[PDB]
Design an enzyme around this catalytic site. Sequence first.
Site, mmCIF file in Angstrom:
data_model
loop_
_atom_site.group_PDB
_atom_site.id
_atom_site.type_symbol
_atom_site.label_atom_id
_atom_site.label_comp_id
_atom_site.label_asym_id
_atom_site.label_seq_id
_atom_site.Cartn_x
_atom_site.Cartn_y
_atom_site.Cartn_z
ATOM 1 N N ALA A 135 29.016 4.060 7.086
ATOM 2 C CA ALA A 135 27.617 2.633 7.907
ATOM 3 C C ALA A 135 28.953 1.191 8.264
ATOM 4 O O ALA A 135 30.176 1.796 8.662
ATOM 5 C CB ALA A 135 27.976 2.276 6.280
ATOM 6 N N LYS A 158 20.825 6.680 12.053
ATOM 7 C CA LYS A 158 20.817 5.683 12.387
ATOM 8 C C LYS A 158 20.083 4.691 10.966
ATOM 9 O O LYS A 158 18.501 4.835 11.623
ATOM 10 C CB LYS A 158 21.510 4.876 12.970
ATOM 11 C CG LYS A 158 22.061 3.680 12.535
ATOM 12 C CD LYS A 158 22.052 2.433 13.458
ATOM 13 C CE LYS A 158 23.897 2.467 13.828
ATOM 14 N NZ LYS A 158 24.532 1.438 14.408
ATOM 15 N N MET A 169 27.577 13.151 17.742
ATOM 16 C CA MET A 169 28.836 13.522 18.108
ATOM 17 C C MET A 169 30.116 13.721 17.538
ATOM 18 O O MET A 169 30.023 13.086 16.677
ATOM 19 C CB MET A 169 28.988 12.119 18.889
ATOM 20 C CG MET A 169 27.798 11.331 20.353
ATOM 21 S SD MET A 169 27.728 12.444 21.546
ATOM 22 C CE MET A 169 29.791 12.193 23.106
ATOM 23 N N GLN A 201 37.234 5.803 14.663
ATOM 24 C CA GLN A 201 37.605 6.825 13.887
ATOM 25 C C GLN A 201 39.064 7.805 14.441
ATOM 26 O O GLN A 201 39.588 8.413 13.820
ATOM 27 C CB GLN A 201 36.404 7.744 13.677
ATOM 28 C CG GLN A 201 35.809 6.921 12.345
ATOM 29 C CD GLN A 201 34.490 8.240 12.580
ATOM 30 O OE1 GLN A 201 33.343 7.922 13.689
ATOM 31 N NE2 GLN A 201 33.037 8.088 11.431
ATOM 32 N N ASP A 210 27.600 -5.304 21.715
ATOM 33 C CA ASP A 210 27.914 -5.019 21.100
ATOM 34 C C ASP A 210 29.040 -3.544 21.094
ATOM 35 O O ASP A 210 29.636 -2.496 20.443
ATOM 36 C CB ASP A 210 27.172 -3.823 19.725
ATOM 37 C CG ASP A 210 27.637 -3.627 18.106
ATOM 38 O OD1 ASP A 210 28.334 -5.099 18.337
ATOM 39 O OD2 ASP A 210 26.763 -3.062 17.600
ATOM 40 N N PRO A 212 35.182 -0.265 19.619
ATOM 41 C CA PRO A 212 35.243 1.117 19.445
ATOM 42 C C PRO A 212 34.838 2.210 18.499
ATOM 43 O O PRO A 212 34.684 3.329 18.513
ATOM 44 C CB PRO A 212 36.949 0.750 18.401
ATOM 45 C CG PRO A 212 37.011 -0.551 18.948
ATOM 46 C CD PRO A 212 36.286 -1.396 19.196
ATOM 47 N N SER A 213 33.797 1.344 17.327
ATOM 48 C CA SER A 213 33.281 1.859 16.982
ATOM 49 C C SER A 213 31.934 2.388 17.260
ATOM 50 O O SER A 213 30.679 3.417 16.616
ATOM 51 C CB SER A 213 33.008 1.066 15.699
ATOM 52 O OG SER A 213 31.736 0.396 15.553
ATOM 53 N N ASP A 242 24.691 2.289 20.496
ATOM 54 C CA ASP A 242 23.714 0.791 19.846
ATOM 55 C C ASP A 242 23.921 -0.457 20.393
ATOM 56 O O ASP A 242 24.270 -1.675 20.160
ATOM 57 C CB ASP A 242 25.325 -0.003 18.865
ATOM 58 C CG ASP A 242 25.142 1.249 17.734
ATOM 59 O OD1 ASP A 242 23.821 2.132 17.943
ATOM 60 O OD2 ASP A 242 25.453 1.649 16.537
ATOM 61 N N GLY A 273 21.963 -2.660 22.176
ATOM 62 C CA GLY A 273 20.267 -3.756 21.730
ATOM 63 C C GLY A 273 19.001 -3.702 22.872
ATOM 64 O O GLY A 273 19.504 -3.175 24.058
#
Length: 292
Positions: free
Chosen positions: A35, A56, A105, A112, A149, A152-153, A167, A169
């Site tokens: 999350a 998502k 993915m 992570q 945005d 790394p995430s 992610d 926009g």
Amino acid sequence: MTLQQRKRLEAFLTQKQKVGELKDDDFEKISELGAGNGGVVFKVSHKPSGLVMARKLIHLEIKPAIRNQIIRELQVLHECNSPYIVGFYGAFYSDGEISICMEHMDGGSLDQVLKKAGRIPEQILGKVSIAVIKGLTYLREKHKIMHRDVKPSNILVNSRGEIKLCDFGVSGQLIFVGTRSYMSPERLQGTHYSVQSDIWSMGLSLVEMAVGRYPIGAIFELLDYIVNEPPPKLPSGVFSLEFQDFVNKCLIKNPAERADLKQLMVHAFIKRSDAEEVDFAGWLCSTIGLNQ
Ligand SMILES: CC1(C)CNC(=O)c2sc(Nc3ccc(I)cc3F)c(C(=O)N[C@@H]3CCCNC3)c2C1
Ligand SMILES: Nc1ncnc2c1ncn2[C@@H]1O[C@H](COP(=O)(O)OP(=O)(O)NP(=O)(O)O)[C@@H](O)[C@H]1O
Ligand SMILES: [Mg+2]
């Protein structure tokens, strides 16, 4: 594009067609991928196709006219087709939550991966940088989209050695509630901003992955520091002068004197990295390990 990239994209777009309109009923939960800022991501099985997807869930309070314009703007994601962008399947509203369904993915995000690796080698970060730049270039040229945005995430990886952005926009704006920030000094100032802001985000993300830690170094104290103090840098001695110069140029605080996409792509770090045969896929698969 390489022939294999050309082909991998071919292969994706065909079974995307083997997918109809999506509904809550047709999805089956497998596991939870994580999350974030107000989004929950689930590894899902879409039964009609049997396809593995990432789903998502975004709790956007209140509909009705505002929710249906969001889903229609999300439809441009069907046109975002690049080896440096994560594949889109579709988007809907359900139970007070917008669902964005995308390509799964299996390596997860570089956030992570970093948590596992401790730190990510410089030669690997060259491959990551080339991919991020090319993905940002693709979004700009083909869609006039800026990411907004980069972190790394939001850089995803898989067992085929692909590095992809997600992610970004597409609904306008709609553009600190947490503990960390990848926003450029000029974005924090409310100043106008451009893709230069994504370059700063990329530069910061690279320094975080090289050293194993968010490099700045309370939320508003942190934002004040980004705005007012010198940018972070790599430590000397352990990283190549050209990698140090590469992130330095991404982290110049004046967005206008900061390097642009064109300049970075011909930068000595990128030139060197592009000519290096680095087995990124092997690195990643050996690092995360296999399901046993
Ligand atoms: C609100 C939103 C649906 C507007 N539409 C939007 O334009 C988007 S798009 C988009 N993400 C996205 C983008 C590209 C791909 I490929 C896959 C994706 F999931 C997102 C997204 O997830 N935004 C999150 C909401 C939670 C807080 N952090 C920002 C959005 C936002
Ligand atoms: N397509 C995907 N495949 C695998 N993992 C994913 C995918 N999309 C998202 N994730 C994971 O889901 C977790 C949470 O994602 P997310 O809600 O996007 O948090 P975030 O990226 O930190 N914030 P934001 O991207 O700004 O909404 C992250 O650890 C991602 O690695
Ligand atoms: Mg994300």
